[PDB]
Design goal:
The structure is cut from a larger assembly and holds 2 copies of chain A (about 50 residues). Chain A has about 50 residues and is mostly loops. The first copy, chain A, contains no helices and 2 strands. The first copy, chain A, has a two-stranded antiparallel ribbon with strand order 1-2. Chain A is flat. The chains hardly touch. Chain A: Belongs to the flagella basal body rod proteins family. Chain A: A flexible structure which links the flagellar filament to the drive apparatus in the basal body. Chain A: It is found in: Bacterial flagellum basal body. Chain A: This is Flagellar hook protein FlgE. Chain A: It comes from Salmonella typhimurium.
Chain lengths: ~50, ~50
């Protein structure tokens, strides 16, 4: 497979002062093959499959 | 209209069973679980096996 080449964003990371070095939120916009399990209508009308 | 079947989340009484694979939370967490199709699930059920 070709290698992913992306941008990693350490924005909003502040320096807590006494404690442990700790991570709050990791997120990434890549994903695996997801086949089909279910589908649902939501209260606003977003017909959305999981 | 039934707005929904809501459920309270005060913890129960921790019953000590001497079997080792019986880990159960007593505060706000939940166990994360998958199965044969690869779906996310969350529990508090304690008794575990191999």
């Amino acid at each position: 497979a070709t290698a992913a080449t992306f941008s990693l964003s350490f924005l909003n990371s502040m320096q807590q002062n006494t404690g442990a070095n700790n991570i709050v939120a990791t997120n990434q916009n890549g994903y695996k093959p997801g086949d089909l399990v279910s589908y649902q209508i939501n209260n606003d009308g977003t017909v959305v499959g999981n | 209209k039934v707005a929904g079947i809501t459920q309270d989340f005060t913890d129960g009484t921790t019953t000590n069973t001497g079997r080792g694979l019986d880990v159960a939370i007593s505060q706000n967490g939940f166990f994360r679980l998958v199965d044969s199709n690869g779906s996310v699930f969350y529990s508090r059920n304690g008794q575990f096996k191999l």
